[PDB]
Amino acid sequence: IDINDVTPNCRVALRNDSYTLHKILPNKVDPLVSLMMVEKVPDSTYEMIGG
Amino acid sequence: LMPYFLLTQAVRTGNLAKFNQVLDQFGEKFQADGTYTLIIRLRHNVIKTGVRMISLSYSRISLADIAQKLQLDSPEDAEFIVAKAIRDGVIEASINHEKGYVQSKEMIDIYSTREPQLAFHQRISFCLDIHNMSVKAMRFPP
Amino acid sequence: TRPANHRQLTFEEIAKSAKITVNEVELLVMKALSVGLVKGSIDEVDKRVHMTWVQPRVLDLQQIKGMKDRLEFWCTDVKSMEMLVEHQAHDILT
Amino acid sequence: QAAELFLDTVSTFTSYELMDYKTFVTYTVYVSMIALERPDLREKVIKGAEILEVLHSLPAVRQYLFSLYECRYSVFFQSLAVVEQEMKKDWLFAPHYRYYVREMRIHAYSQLLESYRSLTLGYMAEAFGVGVEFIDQELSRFIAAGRLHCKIDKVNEIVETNRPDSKNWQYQETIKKGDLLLNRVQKLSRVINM
Amino acid sequence: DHCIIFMDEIDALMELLNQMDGFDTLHRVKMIMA
Amino acid sequence: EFLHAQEEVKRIQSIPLVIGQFLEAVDQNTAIVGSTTGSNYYVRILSTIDRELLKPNASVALHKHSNALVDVLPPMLTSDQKPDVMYADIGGMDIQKQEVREAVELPLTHFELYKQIGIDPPRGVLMYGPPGCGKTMLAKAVAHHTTAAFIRVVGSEFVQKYLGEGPRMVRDVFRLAKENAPAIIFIDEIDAIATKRFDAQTGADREVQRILLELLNQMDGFDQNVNVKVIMATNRADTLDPALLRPGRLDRKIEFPLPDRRQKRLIFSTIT
Amino acid sequence: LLKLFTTMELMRWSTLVEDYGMELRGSTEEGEKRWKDLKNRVVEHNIRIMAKYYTRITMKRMAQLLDLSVDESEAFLSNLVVNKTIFAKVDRLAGIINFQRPKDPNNLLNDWSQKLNSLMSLVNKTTHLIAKEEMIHNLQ
Amino acid sequence: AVQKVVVHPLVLLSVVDHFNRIGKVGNQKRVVGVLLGSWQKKVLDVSNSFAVPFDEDDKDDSVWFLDHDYLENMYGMFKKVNARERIVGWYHTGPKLHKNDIAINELMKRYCPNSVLVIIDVKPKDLGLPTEAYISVEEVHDDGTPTSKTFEHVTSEIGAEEAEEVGVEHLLRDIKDTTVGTLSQRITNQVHGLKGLNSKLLDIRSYLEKVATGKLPINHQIIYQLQDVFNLLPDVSLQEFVKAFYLKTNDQMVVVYLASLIRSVVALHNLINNKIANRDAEKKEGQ
Amino acid sequence: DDEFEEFPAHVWEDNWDDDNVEDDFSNQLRAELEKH
Amino acid sequence: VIDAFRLINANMMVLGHEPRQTTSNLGHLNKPSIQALIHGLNRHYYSITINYRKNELEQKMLLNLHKKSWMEGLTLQDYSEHCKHNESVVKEMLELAKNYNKAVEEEDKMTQDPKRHLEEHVDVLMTSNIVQCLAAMLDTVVFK
Amino acid sequence: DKKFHGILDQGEGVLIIFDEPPVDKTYEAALETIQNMSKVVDSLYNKAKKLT
Amino acid sequence: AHHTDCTFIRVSGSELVQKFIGEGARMVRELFVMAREHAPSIIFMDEIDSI
Ligand SMILES: Nc1ncnc2c1ncn2[C@@H]1O[C@H](COP(=O)(O)OP(=O)(O)O)[C@@H](O)[C@H]1O
Numbered sequence A: 001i002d003i004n005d006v007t008p009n010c011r012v013a014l015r016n017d018s019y020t021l022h023k024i025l026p027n028k029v030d031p032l033v034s035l036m037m038v039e040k041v042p043d044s045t046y047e048m049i050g051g
Numbered sequence B: 001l002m003p004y005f006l007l008t009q010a011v012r013t014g015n016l017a018k019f020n021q022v023l024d025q026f027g028e029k030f031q032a033d034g035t036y037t038l039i040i041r042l043r044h045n046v047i048k049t050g051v052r053m054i055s056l057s058y059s060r061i062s063l064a065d066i067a068q069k070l071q072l073d074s075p076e077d078a079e080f081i082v083a084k085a086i087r088d089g090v091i092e093a094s095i096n097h098e099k100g101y102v103q104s105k106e107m108i109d110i111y112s113t114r115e116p117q118l119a120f121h122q123r124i125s126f127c128l129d130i131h132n133m134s135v136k137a138m139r140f141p142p
Numbered sequence C: 001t002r003p004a005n006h007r008q009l010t011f012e013e014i015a016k017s018a019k020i021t022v023n024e025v026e027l028l029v030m031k032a033l034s035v036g037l038v039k040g041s042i043d044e045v046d047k048r049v050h051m052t053w054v055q056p057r058v059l060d061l062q063q064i065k066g067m068k069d070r071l072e073f074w075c076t077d078v079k080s081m082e083m084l085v086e087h088q089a090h091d092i093l094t
Numbered sequence D: 001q002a003a004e005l006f007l008d009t010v011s012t013f014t015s016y017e018l019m020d021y022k023t024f025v026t027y028t029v030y031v032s033m034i035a036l037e038r039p040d041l042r043e044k045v046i047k048g049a050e051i052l053e054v055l056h057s058l059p060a061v062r063q064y065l066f067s068l069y070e071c072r073y074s075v076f077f078q079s080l081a082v083v084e085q086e087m088k089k090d091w092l093f094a095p096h097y098r099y100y101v102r103e104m105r106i107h108a109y110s111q112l113l114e115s116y117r118s119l120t121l122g123y124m125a126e127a128f129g130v131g132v133e134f135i136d137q138e139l140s141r142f143i144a145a146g147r148l149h150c151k152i153d154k155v156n157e158i159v160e161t162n163r164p165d166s167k168n169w170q171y172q173e174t175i176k177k178g179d180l181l182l183n184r185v186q187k188l189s190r191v192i193n194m
Numbered sequence E: 001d002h003c004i005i006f007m008d009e010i011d012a013l014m015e016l017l018n019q020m021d022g023f024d025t026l027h028r029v030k031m032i033m034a
Numbered sequence F: 001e002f003l004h005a006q007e008e009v010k011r012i013q014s015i016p017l018v019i020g021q022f023l024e025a026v027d028q029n030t031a032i033v034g035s036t037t038g039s040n041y042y043v044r045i046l047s048t049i050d051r052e053l054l055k056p057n058a059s060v061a062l063h064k065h066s067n068a069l070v071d072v073l074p075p076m077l078t079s080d081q082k083p084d085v086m087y088a089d090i091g092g093m094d095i096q097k098q099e100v101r102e103a104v105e106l107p108l109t110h111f112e113l114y115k116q117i118g119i120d121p122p123r124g125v126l127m128y129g130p131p132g133c134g135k136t137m138l139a140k141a142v143a144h145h146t147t148a149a150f151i152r153v154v155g156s157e158f159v160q161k162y163l164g165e166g167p168r169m170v171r172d173v174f175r176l177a178k179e180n181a182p183a184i185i186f187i188d189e190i191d192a193i194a195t196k197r198f199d200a201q202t203g204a205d206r207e208v209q210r211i212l213l214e215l216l217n218q219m220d221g222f223d224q225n226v227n228v229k230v231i232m233a234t235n236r237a238d239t240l241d242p243a244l245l246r247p248g249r250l251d252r253k254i255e256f257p258l259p260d261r262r263q264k265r266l267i268f269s270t271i272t
Numbered sequence G: 001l002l003k004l005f006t007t008m009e010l011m012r013w014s015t016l017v018e019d020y021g022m023e024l025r026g027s028t029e030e031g032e033k034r035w036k037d038l039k040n041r042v043v044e045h046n047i048r049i050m051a052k053y054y055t056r057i058t059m060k061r062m063a064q065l066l067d068l069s070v071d072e073s074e075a076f077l078s079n080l081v082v083n084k085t086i087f088a089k090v091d092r093l094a095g096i097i098n099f100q101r102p103k104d105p106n107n108l109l110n111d112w113s114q115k116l117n118s119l120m121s122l123v124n125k126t127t128h129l130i131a132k133e134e135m136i137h138n139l140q
Numbered sequence H: 001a002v003q004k005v006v007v008h009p010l011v012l013l014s015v016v017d018h019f020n021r022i023g024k025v026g027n028q029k030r031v032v033g034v035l036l037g038s039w040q041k042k043v044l045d046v047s048n049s050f051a052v053p054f055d056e057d058d059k060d061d062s063v064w065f066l067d068h069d070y071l072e073n074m075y076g077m078f079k080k081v082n083a084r085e086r087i088v089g090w091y092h093t094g095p096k097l098h099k100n101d102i103a104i105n106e107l108m109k110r111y112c113p114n115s116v117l118v119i120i121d122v123k124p125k126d127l128g129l130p131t132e133a134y135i136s137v138e139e140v141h142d143d144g145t146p147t148s149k150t151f152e153h154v155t156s157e158i159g160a161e162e163a164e165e166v167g168v169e170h171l172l173r174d175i176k177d178t179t180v181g182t183l184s185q186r187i188t189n190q191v192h193g194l195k196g197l198n199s200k201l202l203d204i205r206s207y208l209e210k211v212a213t214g215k216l217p218i219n220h221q222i223i224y225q226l227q228d229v230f231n232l233l234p235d236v237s238l239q240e241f242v243k244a245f246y247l248k249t250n251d252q253m254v255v256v257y258l259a260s261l262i263r264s265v266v267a268l269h270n271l272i273n274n275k276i277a278n279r280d281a282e283k284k285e286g287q
Numbered sequence I: 001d002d003e004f005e006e007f008p009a010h011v012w013e014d015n016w017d018d019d020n021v022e023d024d025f026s027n028q029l030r031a032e033l034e035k036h
Numbered sequence J: 001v002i003d004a005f006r007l008i009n010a011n012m013m014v015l016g017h018e019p020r021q022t023t024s025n026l027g028h029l030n031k032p033s034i035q036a037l038i039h040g041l042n043r044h045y046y047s048i049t050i051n052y053r054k055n056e057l058e059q060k061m062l063l064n065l066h067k068k069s070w071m072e073g074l075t076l077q078d079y080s081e082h083c084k085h086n087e088s089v090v091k092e093m094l095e096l097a098k099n100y101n102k103a104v105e106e107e108d109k110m111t112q113d114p115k116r117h118l119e120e121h122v123d124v125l126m127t128s129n130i131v132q133c134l135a136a137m138l139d140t141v142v143f144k
Numbered sequence K: 001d002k003k004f005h006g007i008l009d010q011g012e013g014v015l016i017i018f019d020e021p022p023v024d025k026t027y028e029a030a031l032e033t034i035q036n037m038s039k040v041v042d043s044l045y046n047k048a049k050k051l052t
Numbered sequence L: 001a002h003h004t005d006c007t008f009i010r011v012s013g014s015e016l017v018q019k020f021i022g023e024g025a026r027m028v029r030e031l032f033v034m035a036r037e038h039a040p041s042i043i044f045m046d047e048i049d050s051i
């Protein structure tokens, strides 16, 4: 992996042996809010509104 | 098949008069397709069909009561015809002339028996054969 | 003495054995079961006794020869079925 | 389907151009009796608000339905003769009265014999309000046709009931349906393998 | 499992789950809440 | 040899494993976990460990070495002290039983009746009434003849002290309701929090209004509930917020008056 | 008396009254109701003994074993059966009282399998004992 | 007394090694050693062993020199190594007992009152476990036959700690048998079961023939067990067993038939998929 | 595949019962009651 | 996890000599582990191969560990448990068959897990049923 | 109306009760699977014949 | 949200009001970090008067 992709405040995995970085994990923090992005799109449609 | 429609009606009813009418009325088609001896062997198996219905819904019908309900003459003729039906093995019953009745076979529960064994044996053998023939014939080109 | 094939003992059989008329063979089998000698049951509608067990005892040489003969027959049966199966499954024995 | 639709739109009869509501409820009762099992019949035609409200004004049809349900059978045949002569005159049921009568007769006989194993022919005749000869003839006919599960014994007049146990019936259904599937797969394989 | 129960010093209350639940226990055994 | 390999895999699914919380799904075949040791590792989950149920924030066992996730441990607070009162115990209030049932049970037992009409079941009803006429008991009785769960709370339990703890508890309660499929949530005394639109000029009336607003969000919002129901008892029924009283997606209304002569005779009969 | 009431064999009530009859001299006054109670216990112990040493007892014989009437025996069995104290199906038509629980095919074949398992274990142990016996007496 | 003696693979391999390392340098037939293990209820768990110098005259049959000083010193060393293991008897790699065995057991009873002699047969047989275990009993016989100090059988088994399963599995991985029922393996298992039943029945018959002809005395325990076996023989001609057997055979074969039908349908579907793949390949090649 | 040229060539699922009876169940029952 | 080691002389890797010569292709069939590399699997010590030595008698004595008795070969399976297993597997197979119908229809319309699960389940049912049935017949003949 | 497992017998005039063994769910599931495989072989007809 | 081709997020309610100080600001900032990471995005906030 190229160095430029290791930006500050990014989750990196280090070999349990030799502590060598070996991936750029999916940067993420604060589960309290990371559980907040909408995965299931609600079922309401513009046709359900009127007036 | 309409001529055979009429013929089947006649045989099911046991109406020899209507049978003769159908023969005299469509005999040419029978001699054409080729059936004209099987349709007299019919007459024979028409009386046989009567006795088969009688022995399909009854368990101890008395002979004097087969004579009538099979359109016969006498209990002696009943004896002979029903005995021959059993010999041909189309009614599967016994017979008793000490008192004169034709008791059938008390049906035995066919699941404590090897009949399910045998039936499923034929069907399993068949299914295995199709799996064999199907896995075979999976030719690959190169 | 009787093998398991027909170990059904009839009341008339018991009566012709130890001399008691058949209205207290029930009590004889009752006491036999109670003492712990013979296990089983009494089915007296058809007047029979299903002995499923017996107090094993000390036998004689003649009785041991009888057992040897029965073992011989049993071994013949076992070997016959053994050969049949091994001959008919020759291609699927790992 | 006639019974399904009629019972799903009996509470909402709005089509007075086709027939009167009395006629519609009578037709619902008739089709329901010929096409419905006893549980469903009780739930949806005898415990039915409107289908039982109109039967107060219709006295000859209430008797016909309740005879069968209560297992009063002589009245059931009386009302079945009534219904036959009515439907023959009718114009939508006219080429169906033989079949309706026959199938309701089979329903009645099967209902009676569903709770028996050896029903004396005389008693069954007395219950049905007929004779012994008539019952003999018609049971012979229906057993032959294969609808009923019963075998007659005329020397000592007794009608044994050879109903099949659950396991045995499941076996026979497996044989039949597996036979159909085997035929289809056999055709498929024979066709495509070669 | 151990009767007279003695929940004393009730006075001295920002607590709200301590309500008088009053469950059912083996008959006998009582309390003298004061 | 294929059989031997499969057995080696079944063996890698060992017994002495150590439990920990699976956090996220990094990629195909690989994921990030945090052991009960308190430290987080990145590992490869064994083939077919039900990646359907390996949802983020999951309880999972791990191979002591390689920390590989090789299990999903099936993971409470309320609705386990099975109720006792029954519909035979409650006397009278046939109307209240009818309405609470149609709102609470039938949506869970016969939802086909609702589809036929083409209706959204009324999840959320509120019971009026003098200080005591029997509403806690009808709630407990629906709990008796209930099949999903009965999670009971008291509004004080949301009025607890520390900012945001009331909203925290309401959100936890409704989240438990949802995670249970058909569950029911009951709030015993809502007059404490469910109030009017008072312009909170302090730091405390503002927090009480925050509790009510969180309640409104959870009952209806961008996360429409799935088969969850709500029941409230208030004892005043006049100063409740127009929002929470929204005669729409938030609540139905029921009356629980002083036992009339009829009801009172039934009271005597059932008690005596 | 206590010996008889703890013995797993039938006790005839008539002979019991002949033998231990004169030990009632509670069994006085309302001791006659208590006497009926003791007879009930005697009949009930007889029924337990039969249910454990029989499979089909004719009523014409069970009446003799209990000292009751052909109908009183039936009534007492019926009371026991409703109370769920003795398993007994009474085919009144033929006098075929049956204490056999209906045999499930599963249970019948399971009994067969347990017999065979015990058989194989016992032959193995017997073979080990035979090996020891030959190994010893061949030494001498 | 002790009912069960569970021996361990380390014990078995140690005995094999002892026998080999003495037979290579000489010819001693037997080799004799002590067994170390622990109790748990009446279930002895033999988990180690060690050779003790032995020498006997095969003619006299009462002159032998099991070395108790060596036994004590060696046990001291293994007690230092591991302490939850006390002498629980002895072993000797002779296919059959010997006259000395009772005297040797008397010697070893000094160090364990409950002594278990495990006759570990090095020669690999194909039907039985290699361990047969005995314990000495002197008691007034109930039948009034003169009493002498003789051995009595104690049930034996082979079991292993996980630390030894990890080793046996690795050593046998090359010639291992899949730990799953492949239909061929299960039919093989049943054939082997019949083999074993035949072998045991032949043994019983040979013993009974010897007893009848008189070359051996009668053992009432053996006769008891045999007549109990015959007692336990089942009946198959009985009707309400033939009915049940047919019923369950039919149920099992319905499951089999449904399985076969599903297999047939899947096979045809795969054949169709392949024929279509080949057809597409041929068409594309042509175009 | 191949048409075997060598061989020259209601909506009600009826199943027999098209017999000839003295009406289905009216005159039969009338006579039945009459003789009973 | 057993590894054998031996040291490297201080005047071996510093004098310009490889730690251990190589004349056969045998010494490069086993790869080293990073765990040992970190601590210097090739700076201070070797790694000699193991190559366990098994006679023909030790292997048999160890086979005795799990060797199944003739009893286990010829013993039937509890019929109640067997029927429950048949029922459960046939139901799960029914579910997979419904899914399989759906999958085949869908794939044939728009142009697998159901098929593979169905195959494994048919395997297990047939092996269980045939084994128990044959054991039953064998016993019915052998023990009478 | 299915209130108890018994059948009358109007000969000797006798009511015969019995315990009805539960419907073996194995064959129920089996018949359901036969039907579903019929659907599958129909779909396979379509696929094979119309792509070949 | 059902009709957008952009990351939809919800923050509705008192979710930003948590007991420990120096927590709400951190949460809002990390939420907008999430939004900027998965841009383009629409952040919904029901009952802003609460938060
Ligand atoms: N219809 C009723 N039948 C029997 N008891 C009743 C009834 N209504 C009220 N009660 C009594 O009232 C008590 C419960 O009152 P509750 O419903 O808690 O009133 P609230 O919750 O409004 O204070 C119970 O102890 C019960 O005995």
Ligand SMILES: [Mg+2]
Residues within 6 Å of the ligand: F135, F136, F137, F188
């Ligand atoms: Mg309350």
